[PDB]
Ligand binder design. Structure first.
Ligand SMILES: Cc1ncc(COP(=O)(O)O)c(CN)c1O
Lengths: 447, 448
């Protein structure tokens, strides 16, 4: 039985750990939450308190914590050999097998893959591949990237990301990015049917393409369901119409499946959910269930043939691309995910969670409860009629974070509300634990 | 395992979009599939043995086959595989690694944010420098000073920081605010000069560039102690103290890129110790885990961290796998082995021996210069010593040298400029002789 020195860990963390995505000022005064153990959907802190991992780490622990199978896979590969580069025509067996398996799993001619270590690396690779593809085609001015407001594609991709809070204070951003409106009906589609809202979004896309010039737009990048931006579930028919416009102008479609991928939405990939076939797909997170950092980009046969038609070295790559340990762990994780058909439980548990959490809509401070599969959000507002958010001085995010953690729940708490992305294995009883914790924390903060 | 070599080659050609590879050549010839490693040795799918003369990608410092790191990874994965460092969360291995790095990195370099790679680390450092100046009320201080032949990654601002134009070509526009200085490359840029005169010229160029741009607009200077991917450019004696003195004179932050040099490659634990420099920000990757698990990081001084922590706001930057518990645990075990075996010492000794033996190759008419620091070594190939002319692209010196070296059982970086070697810090005298003989034989095969 492992024993931790919580005070020592807190002191060392405050002294030496520059947390990402954290209020460092608050961290120095209050300290971190140190998690030391995990099983399934449960985690334990250094003091022995139990929490439900309602966010699956960072949308990524899809098959749950404590899977010995993945640990043994990593151990076996590391003992055999830990690192073989994919540079200079080198490769390891797990990397090759993962590439072939992903060619099978991703529908259609999405058959060529280059691996990375994260979602931001993957999106950066996809953008560069689109621009390089048009460059090889003799269209060097076709570099502009279409993205959306509230989109999140990484902080390295940072320009593609549509949340402005990530930009402030970090200096200039790479140019060539055009931001469209997010298919966010609650605030942008008031008093509209789904059809009319989709029509307006399509009109905006057409007008933007006309304004910029279709020959200057390399690609469109987007998530099937936007995740970090605020769990924006698109209206019915949005993706087919948007993809049709893009195909009309020849603009490449980059589908960001970093969060939606590998079973979160109720299917293996969100593209299946929305009947879209992208030219480029990006993935990360759930591919390994977060056990080892892994990401990747998959491209169509046409794009790959264009890239492979040049008798020159492809001048792009990250050092750990195709890491053998990551790929072996990914193969085992895919074995478990497919064998247990987790996307089915994701669909069922997500529907149950959405149904129960929608009861929170009765409360005066709950504007909207929305979700797709296991991606769920409770948007908190000061007033339902106006839809006005709580002001920054109220510190809704920190208060909700503290309340949820005190009630043994770990969920993303933001100024806009509560975001839940539990592991795909969550049972109904664990779903009830999450529901009651979220409701009680909301009552604690807002009555 | 149930793999056959031919099936692996076919599947790789069909489905693997290799990075840093001639895809046209790959489709015709297929990949070199490595399946097993121990120490400095690797084996391909057909059972042929090779010396890992590049340590993968400058990163397998303690060598292949260390069961201790595998056991650390297994233990951590069973206990908990992923705990985010976002939202004030952390795991014990991440915290312990941060404290240990605070001890190991000299001076007030005591605050760390982890990443999964070198490019992530350099992007984090650039953003941290700009954000630091922004918090200080200097939003116009965003320009980043870099050098020709510098390599800091191919993503995000790192791509701009990199000074090799071949990486830029065809990928579209890059983030603005990067200024490129001349590389301290004496062999071609400091001809007929002493080290002192060359350093004086470089200092003059840096000062005049700062004056032109305006020091108040320059957030930081980023550079490697020894440039690695750019061509193993060993700086002249006294270069780093003078450059750092100028930077401090204007208040410009110094970002030292220790992704390659870090963790014992140069003969000391970090390259900053070799060249007597104290950076405000340091970036690291590769050797920290010996490549066993993807890990990188950024370390900042107490002043920068205090400035960042003085703002009552969320720090809106981070990569998902920052501080991965398995990576940090493997890093702790790797550091245990590196410190206990004092690998920097063997790096210094073996590097000196390799440089001494390889410098003999300078007797050949096609070897322009052999240079190295620690275990970083390069043989620059030229058509003629007097002319110093590079072989033209049509000769395909890089591919020919690659094929020749692989045929002779050695894996080394072969480029149009020559041969680059970055062997595991554990390389012995006999393995060094194997590497030397293989390189000489490969050079004779291609150029006689
Ligand atoms: C000094 C340096 N910094 C950064 C990088 C990029 O690292 P990564 O591929 O992990 O992003 C490299 C690549 N070898 C490097 O040599």
């Amino acid at each position: 039985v492992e024993t931790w020195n919580a005070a020592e860990l807190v002191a060392k963390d405050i002294a030496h750990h520059l947390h990402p995505l954290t209020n460092l000022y608050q961290l120095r005064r209050e300290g971190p939450l140190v998690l030391v153990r995990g099983e399934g959907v449960w985690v334990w802190d250094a003091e022995g308190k139990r929490y439900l991992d309602g966010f699956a780490g960072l949308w990524n622990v899809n098959i749950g914590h404590g899977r010995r199978e993945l640990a043994e896979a990593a151990r076996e590969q590391m003992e055999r050999v830990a690192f073989v580069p994919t540079f200079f025509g080198l490769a390891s067996p797990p990397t090759i097998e993962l590439a072939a398996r992903l060619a099978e799993l991703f529908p259609g001619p999405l058959d060529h893959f280059q691996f990375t270590s994260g979602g931001a690396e993957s999106n950066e690779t996809a953008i560069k591949i689109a621009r390089y593809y048009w460059w090889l085609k003799g269209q060097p001015e076709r570099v502009k990237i279409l993205s959306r407001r509230m989109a999140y594609h990484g902080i390295a991709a940072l320009s593609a990301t549509g949340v402005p809070a990530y930009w402030e204070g970090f200096g200039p951003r790479p140019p060539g990015f055009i931001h469209l409106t997010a298919p966010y009906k609650y605030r942008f589609g008031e008093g509209l049917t789904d059809e009319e809202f989709v029509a307006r979004l399509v009109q905006e896309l057409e007008e933007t393409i006309e304004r910029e010039g279709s020959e200057t737009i390399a690609a469109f990048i987007g998530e099937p369901v936007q995740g970090a931006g605020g769990v924006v579930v698109p209206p019915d028919g949005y993706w087919p119409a948007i993809a049709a416009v893009l195909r009309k102008y020849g603009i490449l479609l980059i589908l960001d499946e970093v969060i939606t991928g590998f079973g979160r939405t109720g299917t293996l990939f969100g593209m299946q959910q929305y009947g879209v076939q992208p030219d480029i797909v990006t993935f990360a997170k759930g591919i390994t269930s977060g056990y080892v950092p892994l990401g990747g980009v998959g491209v169509s046969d046409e794009i790959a043939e264009t890239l492979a038609s040049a008798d020159r070295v492809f001048m792009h790559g990250f050092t750990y691309s195709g890491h053998p340990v990551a790929c072996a762990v990914a193969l085992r994780n895919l074995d478990i995910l497919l064998a247990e058909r987790l996307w089915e439980n994701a669909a069922a548990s997500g529907a149950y969670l959405l149904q129960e959490l929608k009861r929170l809509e009765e409360r005066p401070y709950v504007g909207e409860v929305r979700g797709k599969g296991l991606m769920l959000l409770v948007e908190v507002v000061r007033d339902k009629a106006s839809k006005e958010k709580f002001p920054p001085e109220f510190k809704l995010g920190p208060k909700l974070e503290a309340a949820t953690r005190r009630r043994g729940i770990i969920v993303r708490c933001t100024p806009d509300g509560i975001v839940m992305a539990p592991p795909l294995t969550i049972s109904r009883a664990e779903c009830d634990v999450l529901i009651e914790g979220v409701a009680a924390a909301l009552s604690d903060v807002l009555d």
